[PDB]
């Protein structure tokens, strides 16, 4: 592995995370009326999540001899994803594809950490799986609720529980 | 302060306390259906922490030398809020209605016994802050339900946690 | 069973279990001095436990297709026991007579609804023997302090834990 | 109490309890959309409820004299209800129906083994009974969501939390 | 009911429960070797739940009118069980046989105070069924260990954690 | 706010609960006798929230640019409060007149403290109000029992919980 | 040391807690009205000590190679004291000076083993030490109740508690 | 990966997981005797947690687009591994001999999907190792219990404990 | 109150909370060697009480009508203070420098919108109150360590324990 | 024993843990800067201990027929060590050398204690040497910090832990 | 007391004890088979609390001013017992056979240290006096074992437990 | 995988992990003076959890067919790292300096287990990577002591909380 490559990676992934756990503030909020109270832990139990992942490529991003961006807007510039930026008619079936978005890009940005640190960086994979596993936990949630998919996933007692990252987490 | 004018602000706002349990009680019951399964947890909610609002004021009545009515039925036509009643055609947004009422009662009854004990009697203006804090957010759930406003409030993990009143319950 | 005749009985018991909680709010308030101390958390136990009480024959009601009564006062005028009113004087022996008698009442209310469902409404059985337990050692504790019969009986370690009612409580 | 007959309806009870555990996999999976993941945690309560009720109904026949029967196929054959089939629509309603058709059978079943060991065989009786007050609730769930008719019950805090048939368990 | 008759039942039921809490100890440290290492602590759950059953009997007895003799070595004469008095020879199969006699020995004298009882004494019938409860899943533990039938019980988590008289524990 | 003017009523305010955690120490002890019993919980209820009350004002002076002064002898000279001797005569009422001068003293000095920083210093404020709470409530069970005044008040779970300043504690 | 004599003196004080924990279950009884609510938790807290001293002088009595007694008549006979048998006048008084002469013998047993195994079997002097703490703190609960004497001591939070002697239990 | 392939051989595993939890139900019960409780939490410990991985192995499946089968007989129909019959011979070594070839048949499929999903299905490799982990140490338990191979696997504290698979329980 | 220009305050506070959270996570990093490990925890005490200020500050805003900027970087640009940037030597005072900079203007932030509120939005004055208390604090620890000051103030048990806006967290 | 000289080497111990508690509170708050963060919890650990020791010495003073002297002026003068003041210079160093020497003296206080209740009064002894245990503690912790000596000792989980004296507190 | 003499049998104590942590572990690998089971979790209790011991006695000897040996080579050849060596036969017997002399070593050297430091070191005693009721309870689960003389002793409720050397834990 | 070169590498890797239990002790033990405070916690949270390492790295040895040697001292001349010797002169920077070689070793001798057993035996990769995990964090704890290059890492809640090897723990 080159680590440049990997810290960039890295580094895009942890503001991918950070704009998530920003974006959802707004999503979360405007999920209203009788529709959006059914959604609203959804969206929230994704973005609890979602500032969890960021605690955890933090540590790893040190690790490997890289820093976070001086300036926070800089750190902004350089997510992997898109805004989720809120719909211009936010409807309940609007915000639900602007986070389906937002969840299958962030199943690709780890599939494709994992595809590059397989058998060569076995932390970074680890740490990257840990968060790939709530990733496509959360695109399922989204997934059957605007599509009706099953997807054979239950609500998260608590939000931000992170089941799969909790070791990662101090 | 004119201490009888202050009591019986406090005992009329610990029978809309109380009356409100035992018409909550109706008012979620009647949340049937799928639409009304989302809302019978917010019902509960208000309608626990409400008569924590009756065992949080009633304490404060008998330090400032006022007694609850010796008749249950004298306590009932003292109440600060009309009764939530049953709607005669108790649909989901009609029991929306009578809960907004309800709870934009409450915060006018509380505004103003705060207005009234500003900077004179700093428990009673804390224990009335205190309860005003979970009627606005009790408005809030019941505004972004009925109207769809963004409110920003997420639900109780557990009914009548009350958050804000706790330390004046035993 | 004619199921009338049982929905008759449990409003009444809940009527009679929600104006207990008033009425044992102020005979709590007014144990006062150095004997009412002693006696001033045996009555807590038995508010909070009759309060669980009213929250355990509520849901039974709903079960049988009956309601609650659409106006507070109604509720109160159908309470199956007289109203446990602070005496005149309300010394200690007076206000524990007023505990006795009203805890007497609770044990032949619930032990008329036992002997009507038994064998015929295991539900309904069931959850009058679970108040019935409670309303019988509620009685042992008044009759024990105010006339000195060996009752056997301990104080709760929290109030309102209701160890027998637990398991219809939410 | 010809203690066969009794084995007989405890093992199709229990194989009632264990198909319905597997059954109510496929329904919840397929409670998919908005109007879905408000059933999903009551068909995930009912589900685990009924896994116990299977637990604690199996040291119940090995205590009686009875054994589980050797081939699972056997068992599944036993069983007292039919068999909870995913609908050829798989609609919420059509979903609601085939869980209320379930429930309404348990209840029946219980009803059944209760009104066969009451005054006979006490232990049998507590066990049935206990089932029975979660089928009773379990019913109620459903009947209020399919139908909309006021029964009185909230939602469990944890699925399989099982109030009734804890004592029963180990 | 005559109630003199019953109150001997509890007393000598009573008695029963006090003398195997001493009884059973004996028992306990003479299960030595591997062979009584694996016993020991099931005797040791039917000891503490014994001593458990004669801290719940005894408020019944005083609610009842009656008293504890007066003497403990009367106490220890009225038992409704003969005692568990350590084998000449103290062999594992030998004291297996001294607590298979003593369980079903009380599960004889709970099963009479049960039909003695049932639909007259509600609360007496339903601690004598708590206990019943017990003590058939006592003898059920020495009956499998000794003879190898199944039984379906496994151990508890707890010593003396008593599932079915808790509630009427302190 | 002159902070010196304001210093000097927190450092004798300090000095008042310090002596106060002493002189509750030595009244504790006299509380004898089956009088005596029902109020020790309560007087130790009261000494340990007023050494919380102690600990929670020694930060905010040192935030304010003040110290505890050098000498024990001489912060024991700066009680707000006359200290709470033990009577001559230490009966039950006479300690109880003892405790209500002490805390009716500690009412005063802490309602004081909010007159003169109400609206100016939010933060000394606060502390002040969150020891005011608990001030008033151990006045109130003072009076109750000496007088016999319904104040409303129940007894601590623990002793020293402190609700009301337990935000300010480590 | 000669073990037979040790051994004597531990089985003497063990039937001395055995016959204490049935006796104490009388007078904790017969502690009645207003006076004795405030003692019977009292009572409570030493009768489940005394039985947590006979759990734990058991198990040094056989280390040693002593037994316990084939018959409980023969244990009952062995206390090294009187019974502690319930007044002719069962006053609170009375019942006072039955505990108190109770808890000064057990003082006296556990005070001869302490000054018989002091430097010689270590185990057992600090078995017998833990003991003494709890005796001593039993004999001055009830020392001071009956005369006045301030002791220092205050409730058990829980009963049978046993702060001393808990690391001999299991 | 064909998703196909890999979605027989996950509802093949969840079919042998579903039947196991049912047949070492029968199994435990027949371990029975001095011998037979030893095994029975070891078994205990095994069935619950193969419940688990049925629990795990079921969301799984509908991610993926797979559905468990309509029938329940057609799902026993497809487990991977023959099923745990109670030997004609239930002795405790015909037992072992039993449960040692279900686990590890277990321990073969997953190491096939282990095998089949490496660095391709990131997810489907977790959790079958999850699940291999814990099958591993099911048959090291039955293989010690049966020829005595140092295993060095310690009890669970708790029964379905399921400490590798618990991240993706719920 | 303008509630216009309490929403610009608000919003420019909590623009500020957000941006320290970032921030602090590099400041954090680079409090290495010996001197910054005792830095490092008072740093994630801050960071993560940071974190919990602007969870608390946006429901308020959504109360009051406002809403959270649609872009990210836009609400980066609107922080109340100047971003808490790592300094050019990131010396161990260089950085306790940034730090009392970023604190001492959330003092100011918050002190502002207090004395704005000041008895016309109780909830938003409540609000502001609870976080100028933990902004107080937290600029105590950086000057104390910086300077040497002493402040009183001890570390918390846990990072983010937020003692003052609990109440206002979900 | 000579109990009344007993009875002063306790009061004058007590003394010196009751001074000990303030004056720790003032050389808590003067080790301030980098080096004075490390020490404030190991002087945070020990005064909350000594706060403790006083708790624990009381009791045991008026079981002795001892009692704390009227006026606390009184009780500052009867400590049996100097005051432990703070440093004309406060450097950690100077402070360090105050600790040291005021752990030195409570060390050879409860040794007295110690080598004259040995064999005489074994529960007198026994709190001694609780005490002394913590003591040895202390004194080994700042003379780590302050020579370099390896002691051994780590820091206490919590503040005033107390893992000796937790016994004798209440 | 010589210190020197005192902190050689203190190191070669916790030499011992280091050791036995080991030589346990092999010993608990290899009692398989059904009769291993049972004896498997009393010698993982005893592995446990003998490295419990070795963390106690650690902090003891640097106390006293002396260190653990440079070299781990050195501190083995320093054990005050014969290693546990596997037998050349590993039965059951024969391993109990060597735990049996490990523990009986065990009780005789601490057995040395107690006679040695008996009223001149407190705190040595007290310690070594905590270990040897540990040892003591050891010894006698392996003579019950091995030989079949009734100890009375319990299995721990969990591994590592330590009731008696916890206050000297970390 | 040739499993005899596999079991050399994980009995070689136990072996550095126990004598490194041992020796983090003697370097624990001599981080002494203000500047060592720091870093006692740090060397604690690592020793415990190598500890951990070599409690799960046992049972794998014995799964695989291998066994611990039979004497300690050729189980200290297998370790894969040197031993970590107390520094001839103890500085903190030497012991800094010892305790960063011993935990880069580490990192390397669970990387050499990683590579060796990357794809033919999944459980043995998943253990060496759960130590792996925690191996560099302890490298990175020395690694930003010794140098300052900003890690990351944030300290333990608990010494030897062991986040990734705890599901390989009982
Ligand atoms: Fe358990
Ligand atoms: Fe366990
Ligand atoms: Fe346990
Ligand atoms: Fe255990
Ligand atoms: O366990
Ligand atoms: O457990
Ligand atoms: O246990
Ligand atoms: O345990």
């Not at 704009?19 to 999920?31: P, Q």
């Not at 990257?128 to 059957?144: M, N, S, T, V, Y």
Request: net charge negative; charged share 30%; with cysteine.
């Amino acid at each position: 592995i080159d680590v440049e490559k990997l810290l960039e990676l890295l580094i895009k992934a942890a503001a991918a995370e950070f704009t998530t756990y920003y974006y959802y503030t707004i999503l979360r909020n405007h999920a209203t009326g009788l529709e959006g109270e059914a959604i609203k832990e959804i969206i929230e139990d994704a973005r609890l999540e979602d500032r969890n992942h960021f605690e955890a490529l933090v540590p790893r991003i040190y690790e490997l001899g890289g820093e976070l961006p001086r300036d926070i807007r800089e750190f902004a510039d350089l997510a992997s994803c898109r805004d989720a930026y809120l719909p211009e008619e936010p409807t309940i079936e609007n915000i639900l594809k602007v986070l389906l978005e937002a969840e299958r890009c962030a199943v690709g940005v780890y599939t494709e950490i994992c595809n590059y640190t397989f058998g060569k960086d076995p932390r970074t994979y680890d740490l990257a799986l840990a968060i790939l596993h709530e990733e496509i936990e959360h695109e399922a949630w989204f997934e059957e609720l605007l599509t009706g998919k099953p997807s054979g996933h239950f609500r998260r007692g608590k939000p931000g529980e992170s089941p799969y990252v909790s070791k990662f987490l101090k």
